Scaffold this active site. Structure first.
Site, PDB file in Angstrom:
ATOM      1  N   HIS F 199       0.714  -1.236  -0.201  1.00  0.00           N
ATOM      2  CA  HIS F 199      -0.146  -0.008  -0.085  1.00  0.00           C
ATOM      3  C   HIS F 199       0.977   1.266  -0.012  1.00  0.00           C
ATOM      4  O   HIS F 199       0.348   2.347  -0.392  1.00  0.00           O
ATOM      5  CB  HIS F 199      -1.304  -0.083   1.013  1.00  0.00           C
ATOM      6  CG  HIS F 199      -2.242  -0.780   0.556  1.00  0.00           C
ATOM      7  ND1 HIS F 199      -2.561  -1.908   1.227  1.00  0.00           N
ATOM      8  CD2 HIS F 199      -2.980  -1.019  -0.438  1.00  0.00           C
ATOM      9  CE1 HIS F 199      -3.644  -2.619   0.955  1.00  0.00           C
ATOM     10  NE2 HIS F 199      -3.749  -2.043  -0.125  1.00  0.00           N
ATOM     11  N   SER F 203      -0.225  -0.404  -6.695  1.00  0.00           N
ATOM     12  CA  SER F 203       0.008  -1.555  -7.615  1.00  0.00           C
ATOM     13  C   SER F 203       1.043  -0.913  -8.599  1.00  0.00           C
ATOM     14  O   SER F 203       0.934  -0.397  -9.217  1.00  0.00           O
ATOM     15  CB  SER F 203      -1.071  -2.234  -8.000  1.00  0.00           C
ATOM     16  OG  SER F 203      -1.554  -3.172  -7.029  1.00  0.00           O
ATOM     17  N   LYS F 225     -14.076  -6.820 -10.172  1.00  0.00           N
ATOM     18  CA  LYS F 225     -13.486  -7.783 -10.989  1.00  0.00           C
ATOM     19  C   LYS F 225     -12.809  -8.695 -10.213  1.00  0.00           C
ATOM     20  O   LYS F 225     -12.514  -9.815 -10.882  1.00  0.00           O
ATOM     21  CB  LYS F 225     -12.621  -6.938 -11.913  1.00  0.00           C
ATOM     22  CG  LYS F 225     -11.190  -7.716 -12.310  1.00  0.00           C
ATOM     23  CD  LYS F 225     -10.814  -6.850 -13.606  1.00  0.00           C
ATOM     24  CE  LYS F 225      -9.058  -7.063 -13.670  1.00  0.00           C
ATOM     25  NZ  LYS F 225      -8.887  -6.688 -15.264  1.00  0.00           N
ATOM     26  N   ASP F 226     -12.676  -8.769  -8.999  1.00  0.00           N
ATOM     27  CA  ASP F 226     -12.199  -9.585  -8.136  1.00  0.00           C
ATOM     28  C   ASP F 226     -13.417 -10.747  -7.774  1.00  0.00           C
ATOM     29  O   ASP F 226     -13.107 -11.828  -7.656  1.00  0.00           O
ATOM     30  CB  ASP F 226     -11.806  -9.197  -6.508  1.00  0.00           C
ATOM     31  CG  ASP F 226     -10.371  -8.386  -6.809  1.00  0.00           C
ATOM     32  OD1 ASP F 226      -9.913  -8.367  -8.103  1.00  0.00           O
ATOM     33  OD2 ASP F 226      -9.837  -7.662  -5.898  1.00  0.00           O
ATOM     34  N   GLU F 269       4.056 -34.243  -3.618  1.00  0.00           N
ATOM     35  CA  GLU F 269       2.950 -33.897  -4.066  1.00  0.00           C
ATOM     36  C   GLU F 269       3.632 -32.626  -5.426  1.00  0.00           C
ATOM     37  O   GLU F 269       4.626 -32.490  -5.163  1.00  0.00           O
ATOM     38  CB  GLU F 269       2.117 -33.101  -3.294  1.00  0.00           C
ATOM     39  CG  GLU F 269       1.074 -33.887  -2.485  1.00  0.00           C
ATOM     40  CD  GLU F 269      -0.044 -34.539  -3.173  1.00  0.00           C
ATOM     41  OE1 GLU F 269      -0.252 -35.484  -3.229  1.00  0.00           O
ATOM     42  OE2 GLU F 269      -0.828 -33.552  -3.771  1.00  0.00           O
TER      43      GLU F 269
HETATM   44  C1  HEM Z   1      -0.117 -16.147   1.350  1.00  0.00           C
HETATM   45  C2  HEM Z   1       0.365 -15.928   0.007  1.00  0.00           C
HETATM   46  C3  HEM Z   1       0.232 -14.510  -0.617  1.00  0.00           C
HETATM   47  C4  HEM Z   1      -0.915 -13.539  -0.420  1.00  0.00           C
HETATM   48  C5  HEM Z   1      -2.093 -13.769   0.278  1.00  0.00           C
HETATM   49  C6  HEM Z   1      -0.485 -12.493  -1.212  1.00  0.00           C
HETATM   50  C7  HEM Z   1      -1.234 -11.388  -1.545  1.00  0.00           C
HETATM   51  C8  HEM Z   1      -0.926 -10.325  -2.567  1.00  0.00           C
HETATM   52  C9  HEM Z   1      -1.971  -9.311  -2.785  1.00  0.00           C
HETATM   53  C10 HEM Z   1      -3.376  -9.315  -2.311  1.00  0.00           C
HETATM   54  C11 HEM Z   1      -1.534  -8.774  -3.662  1.00  0.00           C
HETATM   55  C12 HEM Z   1      -2.112  -7.437  -4.599  1.00  0.00           C
HETATM   56  C13 HEM Z   1      -1.753  -6.972  -5.795  1.00  0.00           C
HETATM   57  C14 HEM Z   1      -2.219  -8.158  -6.746  1.00  0.00           C
HETATM   58  O1  HEM Z   1      -3.273  -8.236  -6.759  1.00  0.00           O
HETATM   59  O2  HEM Z   1      -1.631  -8.925  -7.360  1.00  0.00           O
HETATM   60  C15 HEM Z   1      -0.066  -8.763  -4.070  1.00  0.00           C
HETATM   61  C16 HEM Z   1       0.889  -8.480  -4.767  1.00  0.00           C
HETATM   62  C17 HEM Z   1       2.317  -8.517  -4.745  1.00  0.00           C
HETATM   63  N1  HEM Z   1       2.763  -9.584  -4.279  1.00  0.00           N
HETATM   64 FE1  HEM Z   1       1.657 -11.163  -3.044  1.00  0.00          FE
HETATM   65  N2  HEM Z   1       0.705 -12.668  -1.905  1.00  0.00           N
HETATM   66  C18 HEM Z   1       1.309 -13.865  -1.377  1.00  0.00           C
HETATM   67  C19 HEM Z   1       2.260 -14.295  -1.967  1.00  0.00           C
HETATM   68  C20 HEM Z   1       3.253 -13.723  -2.513  1.00  0.00           C
HETATM   69  C21 HEM Z   1       4.752 -14.296  -3.008  1.00  0.00           C
HETATM   70  C22 HEM Z   1       4.876 -15.979  -3.149  1.00  0.00           C
HETATM   71  C23 HEM Z   1       5.078 -13.250  -3.684  1.00  0.00           C
HETATM   72  C24 HEM Z   1       6.620 -13.279  -4.461  1.00  0.00           C
HETATM   73  C25 HEM Z   1       7.631 -13.913  -3.803  1.00  0.00           C
HETATM   74  C26 HEM Z   1       4.283 -12.205  -3.430  1.00  0.00           C
HETATM   75  C27 HEM Z   1       4.889 -10.883  -4.006  1.00  0.00           C
HETATM   76  C28 HEM Z   1       4.102 -10.096  -4.352  1.00  0.00           C
HETATM   77  C29 HEM Z   1       4.531  -8.651  -5.260  1.00  0.00           C
HETATM   78  C30 HEM Z   1       5.835  -8.308  -5.525  1.00  0.00           C
HETATM   79  C31 HEM Z   1       3.380  -7.917  -5.650  1.00  0.00           C
HETATM   80  C32 HEM Z   1       3.357  -6.592  -6.308  1.00  0.00           C
HETATM   81  C33 HEM Z   1       2.601  -6.915  -7.563  1.00  0.00           C
HETATM   82  C34 HEM Z   1       2.271  -5.812  -8.529  1.00  0.00           C
HETATM   83  O3  HEM Z   1       2.329  -4.588  -8.076  1.00  0.00           O
HETATM   84  O4  HEM Z   1       2.422  -5.798  -9.733  1.00  0.00           O
HETATM   85  N3  HEM Z   1       3.123 -12.391  -3.026  1.00  0.00           N
HETATM   86  N4  HEM Z   1       0.194 -10.167  -3.076  1.00  0.00           N
END
Ligand code: HEM
Ligand code: HEM
Lengths: 49, 75, 48, 111, 58, 377, 105
Positions: F199, F203, F225-226, F269
């Site tokens: 935040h 994004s 859209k979500d 798995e």
């Molecule tokens: C419990 C698992 C995870 C949850 C709940 C989560 C949640 C989120 C959410 C809600 C967003 C909002 C932006 C979007 O809708 O894409 C987001 C973006 C993002 N997440 Fe995650 N994520 C998880 C795992 C990961 C992991 C595995 C990575 C990578 C190492 C990651 C890295 C990022 C990054 C870099 C963004 C910025 C995306 C952008 O602005 O284009 N997250 N994440």
């Protein structure tokens, strides 16, 4: 204690929200009935048994 | 953070919009729509497709050699 | 092994019919709201 | 938010006292405006073009007198409640609400 | 049909969030009755293990 | 008014209502909510499962059968958990991939927390699979846990510490249960911090350009859209659980545990299969687990090897091909990982492993440099 | 100058066309990743270029949203592609590099 809410206008307010509040409660009623079926509250009309 | 009204500075750009209740949600959907998906596919195949077929081929070859190996004629 | 077999596939029929009805509807809900943006026009009028 | 708040409030829960204030504000605007040969002259000419008559103050008074809360919340509803607005903005408008949101403030979920 | 069905659906039942909510919930009931059974019914194009069909034999 | 000022509402308002978002994000941004959804769906069916499951060896498997036959609707609850785990992994894999392709990793904190989130769900899921105490549950519990014994002078003690015994016995099941219960809550707090750091910038978008110039409120636009997005998750999930409940689990893991058997099979798995392939590609106890680990912690090196003057891949052809070769290579890896270590499979499993590391560590950064040069940058 | 230079120039023109920022009427500098050096260069632009830079980014994000693209005639042509940022960026870098040298002594 807590009654500055008495008066022509407040009375008027209340009456403008009556058709609404009544209608709203009916929503929830039909809602509760349909949610737990016609034994757990309100049986009757074209639905089986 | 960030809000609205504190994002950035923009000048001289008009934006016309029309209310959702006055337009169609699916205008030329099949008309304009399909050509677009074809154009997007064209633009991307040569970058998406090849790596995958390289695996596709490695996969079927990989399996044949395996299966054909657990067999044998003389010696 | 799998007693639930029948019912599984019954819910599945209902799941396909419902998804098959909700999916288009949720889409039309979404494009409807996104239409202010998809149909939208820009113009740039800088000082001469 | 506040602007739209008032339209709906009036569409749904307009109360009697304020309606009298309105009626009174309007009686004063009308009479205060027809003060001087110029505004009156203008009024005669315009009226005949649009009304085909000259509407005497006594009639406008009768028309104002008849308005009560019920009318206000009925007449506002007809034009305001859940209708699409025409919005126009100029200046620093980064925070002008998105159309949908402005559109969604034209009705209310309480009601 | 004529001055529109949707128009009347809007005017008589959708202008208020109350009636809106109210119809959705009333519409929820019947839909369930119609579909739950409808899908159970369509499913009957498998006159097989059809418990009813077996009920008669044994 | 009320939404903006109230201490709790602010949070909601700042995260899902008035949050300025790019009017530009595509489907690949939906996996964010989808993981959020998967996380809750996995806690909710998970809790109901814990109301009937028992974590003791002699009833473990029996309690799981008890659920599918006797517990009302126990079966759906059970399969939704099972399939949601894979659904959680497909989404996890889309999400990581999305960020890699779009340069989203330039947000270090968010990303790094993401890696911690990746590890946490992997550790979580691994413990999950052992719970039914099936043939694969026990041997997968054995094979994988034993890796830690490669760590010099500490390893033997380590493996025996977490095992509870000298094998994967009684202590291990109850143990693994407790951590499988506690982990997703920790995951949640961490996802909040994930969202907290995100935040701070809002994004990214497909162009990698910058969208302050065209933001739209998160509300009609991305809530709706979500929603449509979660609906498709449900379809995939339900299509999987109702029509093919054992598809991704493969018909196998039934029949109780037997510490003397050792099935000619043994493979984790599907979501660990790429890592699995990398590990066995190396003839060496230490090196295998060293490269096993490195295959995932490498995500924490990606931002240090950005190299390109543009953030996204949208405008970079060579990089696209290289990216696709990464994904293509990751299929090979899982495919190999799901096969015996015999003639053909060893050498390609070996080659593909080197490629994985050559691609990320050398080929991708080089392409960035070349790309910069072709643009005279 | 000749055969080889034009070949390298043609490879460059090819890449340019492939990179496809042209298709969204973008200019090369509009795609630059925004680090501090660049953030400052943007800041230093004069009124006109800044405004034109915003309209382009806006035009592009718009297109990028409805996943459309501009008619071929309005694509930006390679080398008609004004690299408006370059001189600012260079100077900003040159300033940082000077700060850095001073920080070593
Ligand atoms: C419990 C698992 C995870 C949850 C709940 C989560 C949640 C989120 C959410 C809600 C967003 C909002 C932006 C979007 O809708 O894409 C987001 C973006 C993002 N997440 Fe995650 N994520 C998880 C795992 C990961 C992991 C595995 C990575 C990578 C190492 C990651 C890295 C990022 C990054 C870099 C963004 C910025 C995306 C952008 O602005 O284009 N997250 N994440
Ligand atoms: C705190 C929330 C959770 C609870 C209370 C919980 C509970 C359980 C229980 C009682 C079992 C054994 C019964 C069974 O195997 O069906 C189980 C198995 C399993 N869990 Fe969870 N779980 C939770 C979260 C998660 C998370 C987030 C994941 C990761 C996706 C996960 C992945 C798995 C897997 C793959 C199995 C074995 C699959 C199967 O046999 O159905 N669980 N879980």
């Amino acid at each position: 204690m807590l009654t500055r809410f008495l008066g022509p206008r407040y009375r008027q307010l209340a009456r403008n929200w009556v058709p609404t509040a009544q209608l709203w409660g009916a929503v929830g009623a039909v809602g509760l009935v349909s949610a737990t079926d016609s034994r757990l509250i309100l049986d009757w009309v074209p639905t089986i048994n | 953070g960030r809000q609205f009204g504190h994002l950035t500075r923009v000048r001289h750009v008009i934006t016309y919009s029309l209310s959702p209740f006055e337009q169609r949600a699916f205008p030329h959907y099949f008309s304009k729509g399909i050509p677009n998906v074809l154009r997007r596919t064209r633009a991307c195949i040569l970058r998406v497709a090849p790596p995958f077929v390289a695996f596709y081929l490695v996969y079927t070859w990989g399996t044949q050699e395996f299966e054909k190996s657990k067999r044998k004629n003389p010696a | 092994a799998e007693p639930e077999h029948d019912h599984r596939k019954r819910m599945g029929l209902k799941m396909l019919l419902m998804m098959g009805l909700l999916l288009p509807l949720v889409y039309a809900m979404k494009r409807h709201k996104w239409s202010v943006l998809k149909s939208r026009k820009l113009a740039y009028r800088p000082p001469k | 938010f506040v602007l739209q708040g008032q339209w709906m409030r009036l569409c749904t829960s307009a109360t009697e006292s304020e309606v009298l204030r309105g009626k009174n504000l309007l009686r004063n605007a009308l009479v205060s405006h027809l003060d001087g040969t110029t505004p009156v002259c203008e009024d005669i000419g315009r009226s005949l073009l649009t009304y085909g008559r000259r509407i005497p103050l006594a009639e406008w008074e009768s028309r104002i007198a008849e308005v009560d809360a019920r009318v206000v919340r009925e007449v506002c509803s007809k034009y305001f409640y859940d209708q699409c607005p025409a919005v126009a903005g100029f200046g620093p408008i980064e925070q002008l609400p998105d159309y949908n949101r402005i559109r969604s403030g034209m009705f209310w979920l309480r009601f | 049909v004529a001055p529109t069905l949707t128009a009347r659906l809007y005017s008589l039942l959708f202008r208020r969030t109350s009636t809106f909510a109210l119809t959705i919930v009333v519409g929820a009931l019947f839909f369930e009755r119609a579909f739950d059974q409808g899908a159970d019914a369509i499913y009957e194009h498998i006159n097989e293990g059809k418990l009813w069909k077996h009920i008669k034999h044994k | 008014n009320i939404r903006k000022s109230h201490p709790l509402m602010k949070i909601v308002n700042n995260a899902f209502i008035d949050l300025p978002a790019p009017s530009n994000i595509s489907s690949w941004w939906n996996f964010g909510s989808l993981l959020g959804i998967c996380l809750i769906l996995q806690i909710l069916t998970g809790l109901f499962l814990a109301m009937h499951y028992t974590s003791d060896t002699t009833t473990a498997f029996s309690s799981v059968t008890h659920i599918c036959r006797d517990v009302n609707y126990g079966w759906i609850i059970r399969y939704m958990h099972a399939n949601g785990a894979s659904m959680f992994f497909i989404c996890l894999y889309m999400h990581v991939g999305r960020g890699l392709y779009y340069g989203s990793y330039t947000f270090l904190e968010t990303w790094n927390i993401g890696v911690i989130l990746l590890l946490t769900v992997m550790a979580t899921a691994f413990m999950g699979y052992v719970l039914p105490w099936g043939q694969m549950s026990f041997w997968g519990a054995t094979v994988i846990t034993n890796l830690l014994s490669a760590i010099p002078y500490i390893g033997t003690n380590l493996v025996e510490w977490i095992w509870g015994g000298f094998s994967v016995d009684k202590a291990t099941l109850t143990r693994f249960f407790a951590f499988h219960f506690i982990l997703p809550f920790i995951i949640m707090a961490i996802a909040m911090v994930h969202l907290l750091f995100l935040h701070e910038t809002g994004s990214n978008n497909p162009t990698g350009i910058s969208s302050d110039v065209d933001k739209i409120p998160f509300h009609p636009y991305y809530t709706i859209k979500d929603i449509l997005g979660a609906l498709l998750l449900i379809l995939a999930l339900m299509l999987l659980v109702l029509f093919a409940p054992d598809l991704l689990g493969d018909p196998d893991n039934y029949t109780p545990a037997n510490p003397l058997n050792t099935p000619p099979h043994i493979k984790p798995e599907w979501y660990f299969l790429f890592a699995y392939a990398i590990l066995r590609s190396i003839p060496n106890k230490l090196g295998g687990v060293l490269a096993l680990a490195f295959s995932i912690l490498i995500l924490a090196l990606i931002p240090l090897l950005h190299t390109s003057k543009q953030r996204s891949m949208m405008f970079r052809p060579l990089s696209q091909c290289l990216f696709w070769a990464l994904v293509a290579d990751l299929l090979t890896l899982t495919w190999i990982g799901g096969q015996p270590v015999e003639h053909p499979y060893i050498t390609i499993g070996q080659l593909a492993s080197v490629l994985y590391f050559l691609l990320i560590l050398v080929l991708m950064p080089t392409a960035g440099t070349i790309e910069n040069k072709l643009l005279k940058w | 100058v000749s055969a080889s230079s034009r070949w390298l120039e043609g490879i460059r023109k090819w890449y340019y066309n492939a990179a496809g920022f042209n298709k969204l009427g973008l200019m090369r500098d509009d795609t630059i990743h925004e680090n501090d050096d660049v953030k400052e260069a943007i800041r230093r632009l004069p009124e006109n270029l800044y405004d034109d830079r915003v309209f382009r980014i806006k035009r592009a994000l718009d297109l990028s949203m409805r996943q459309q693209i501009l008619p071929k005639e309005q694509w930006t042509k390679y080398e008609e592609d004004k690299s408006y940022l370059e001189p600012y960026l260079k100077e900003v870098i040159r300033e940082r590099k000077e700060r850095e040298e001073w920080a070593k002594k």
